[PDB]
Structures are given as C-alpha cells and as structure tokens.
C-alpha cells in the first residue's frame, strides 16, 4: 500500500475509528520550499537531543527544535518552550490553519542531515496531545518516506507515503491510536530534509 | 551583460498615476526575487514591494500599501510597479532590484526619477 | 514628511579599520545583507547571508552576527571603500523587506 497521489485517505475504520491522512502536494510551491529550507536550515535553534531508552543515553538520529509555549515531552526526554515562533513558521501555521479548518499551538520541527537520521516506529499519542489528535506535516528538502504500520489488536497493514519538497500531510482521526509511523534510514544518499509537525498541545 | 532597465518613469501631478517597468535582459526572472526599492534625493534606501516570480505572492511597504500594486510577466521577462493616487512624497528614484534569494539583490537597474508635483 | 533619514556620518582614513553595526533586536534570523552605494550609482550587494562574501567583493569586506547584531567590517579601507553602507535588516520569508538608514564613510583631512 502505497500513497503518493493528492488526496483523501480514509487509512482504516476499525478498532477505534476512521484514521485519516490527507496529502496535498506543492502545498508550498517549489522556489519558495526551496528558500524555506534555507532559512530554516540556517535560524532554526537545532539541536541534537539525547534519549533515555531502558537506562541507556543515546544520541537521536536527528536535529530538533521545538516551537510553543507549553513544554513537549516524548521518549523520556523534555522539549523547553520557545513562545517567540520564527516568523516563516508562524507564516506556515496560518496557511495551514486557514487551508484546513485546524488551529496548531505547537510545532515540533526535525531536520534529517542525510540518509543516517531517521525516527523510529512510534504513534503520536500522548496525553498532552489529547484524544484523536490532529497533526499537520510539512516537508522541505529531499524526499523521505513516512511509513506506516496498522497496530494488531492483543495478540500487519502497512502503508508507505513518500513526503517530497513542500508537501502537507494531514492525519486526524484514529490514526495515532491504530497505527505508528516511522522514517526509516535510507542506503542512497539523501540531501537534508527538514520536517515541521504543527499540533495541539494541551495543559 | 546580465542587465536590468526601468522605463515609465517621469513627472505626474499628484493624485496621478504611473506604471514602470523594468525589462529584464541578460538572465531570466523565472524563480527568483524582484524588488522595487526608492531613494528620496538626498535620503536612504526605501524598500517599496517584492514579487515571488514562481507563485507571484508580492509584498508593500506600509507607505505603499493600497496604491502600489507589483507584478511580473515571464513571457517577456517584464516587472511591473503599478503606482495609483501617488503623492508628493513618493518622488524619488525608483530602483528595479533581482536576487535568486528572497531579499539579497545582486542585480540593480540604474534607475528611474519619479516626480510627483503640481 | 520624510520616509527614511539622511545616512549618518563616520569619518576614517585610508588603512582604518571600520566596523559597522546594524542592530535588528529581537530578530531570529541571519538573513541580512549589506550593501555599499557611490553618489548617483546604484546600490551593489557585498554581503548575503550575513557573512557571506558576495561573488567578487574584495576580500577586506567582512561580515558576521553576534546575537541579534550584524556587523559589516573592512579590514583596511582603500580610496573607493568610501560610500554609503545599507544594512538590510533580517528577511523573513513572506514578510516585508527593511533597509537600515545609511553609514557614509568620508576621508579625514
């Protein structure tokens, strides 16, 4: 299963509910994507963070920063917040907002350096997400995939998105409580990618 | 040669309006940056109004907004700044500016006098 | 009325070394450029990106960012080093373009 056509996709329906993605490619158009990666490239405060995975301390396979005015806490580890939002992001939340109908306090951005960063299978269920939580995803740079993987019932579906240079991605609905998602490394070189996940962070 | 020329410039009185152009040779004004940018005689570098040339979003000056309006042609490699209702203090020399970034002009016109007077 | 100030004025000699400071408080971005203008020509562009030397700017032409301020440096100036310098304030992708107000270096005598 494979997504790469503009679209509305009703992943799954069951256990929990409708999980849906929504693609819209060329969101951003290509020259400005262009000049978004490079200034986000540049002002952007990243960071690599180290996690706590079963008492071991390790590197994550990318750069991070967060945006928001209330803290982000995810694989043990603890985003500070930054209330002032670079001007460019804040620009992207409202035309995301307004192009949607779904309002974001908070943006989490990654920056994979080359084909060796990635993230891991996890679902973006915590607490501070609230239920069904809507995330928007807007991607900068080289093509990555962002695979997906239904989750079994106690006791597999999977789904690959290729996510090219100003592309949106929208997930709503059950989709972080029945499937996880992932970037995998890749074996060809990759130039940088940078990703921002706009969402709504609750007290 | 990779140059740059502005034409429409001159005299109107106040109120008035003008439309200059800036004719691009040389290189192509495909995916890059234009910039309008005025010198009062005597005065600093007033930035007027930018056009993105691929999705054509433009942005003012505050002293600019609601009587200015940028636009670009591809097919001719032609800039446009529409100037309406235009007073006494927009005359200056009006400069036709072009970068492949979105704010650093590496390629400046010579530029047109503007006079606005009665 | 008047949109913009006439440049301020800093006086040096051949073989001085100048530092120009461009202060764009709470900024968060290194998209600043500086530009040098002769009387009756038009501006050139001598840094992008805030240190960036542009393609075949004399090399005494420097420029770099502590913090939210951006400084343009000529090592030692040489006869047509004496001009007026434009700070273009940080450009934000989307969001309006701003000159800083002019530093006109003149010869001591």
């Known amino acids: 299963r494979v997504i790469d056509r503009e679209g509305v996709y009703e992943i799954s329906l069951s256990p929990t509910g409708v999980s849906r993605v929504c693609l819209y490619p060329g969101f951003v158009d290509v020259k400005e994507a262009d000049w978004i990666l490079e200034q986000l490239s540049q002002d952007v405060p990243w960071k690599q963070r180290t996690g706590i995975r079963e008492d071991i301390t390790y590197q994550q396979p990318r750069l991070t920063a967060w945006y928001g005015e209330l803290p982000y806490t995810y694989s043990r580890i603890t985003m500070e917040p930054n209330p002032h939002w670079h001007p460019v992001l804040r620009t992207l939340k409202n035309r995301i907002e307004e192009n949607t109908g779904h309002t974001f306090n908070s943006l989490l951005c990654n920056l994979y350096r080359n084909e060796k960063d990635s993230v891991d299978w996890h679902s973006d269920d915590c607490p501070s997400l609230g239920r069904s939580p809507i995330i928007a995803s807007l991607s900068f740079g080289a093509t990555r995939t962002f695979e997906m993987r239904k989750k079994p019932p106690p006791e597999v579906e999977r789904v690959k998105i290729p996510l090219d240079h100003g592309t949106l991605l929208i997930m709503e609905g059950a989709t972080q409580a029945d499937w996880q998602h992932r970037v995998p490394k890749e074996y060809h070189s990759r130039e940088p990618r940078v990703n921002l996940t706009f969402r709504t962070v609750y007290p | 040669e990779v140059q740059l020329v502005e034409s429409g410039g001159g005299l109107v009185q106040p109120g008035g309006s003008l439309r200059l152009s800036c004719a691009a040779s040389?290189?192509?004004?495909?995916?890059?940056?234009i910039h309008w940018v005025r010198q009062a005689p005597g005065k600093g570098l007033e930035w007027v109004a930018y056009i993105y040339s691929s999705s054509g979003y433009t942005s003012y000056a505050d002293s600019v907004k609601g009587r200015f309006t940028i636009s670009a042609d591809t097919s001719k490699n032609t800039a446009y700044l529409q100037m309406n209702s235009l007073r006494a203090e927009d005359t200056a020399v009006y400069y036709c500016?072009?970068?492949?970034?979105?704010?650093?002009?590496?390629?400046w016109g010579q530029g047109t006098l503007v006079t606005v007077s009665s | 009325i008047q949109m913009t100030q006439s440049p301020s004025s800093l006086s040096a000699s051949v073989g001085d070394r100048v530092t120009i400071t461009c202060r764009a408080s709470?900024?968060?971005?290194?998209?600043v450029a500086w530009y040098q203008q002769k009387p009756g020509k038009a501006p050139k562009l001598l840094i992008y990106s805030a240190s960036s030397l542009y393609s075949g700017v004399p090399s005494r032409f420097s420029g770099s960012r502590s913090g939210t301020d951006f400084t343009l440096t000529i090592s030692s100036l040489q006869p047509e080093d004496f001009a007026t310098y434009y700070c273009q304030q940080p450009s934000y992708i989307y969001y309006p373009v701003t000159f800083g107000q002019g530093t006109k270096v003149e010869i001591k005598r």
């Open positions: 500016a072009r970068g492949d970034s979105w704010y650093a002009m590496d390629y």
């Open positions: 040389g290189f192509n004004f495909s995916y890059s940056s």
């Open positions: 709470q900024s968060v971005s290194s998209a």
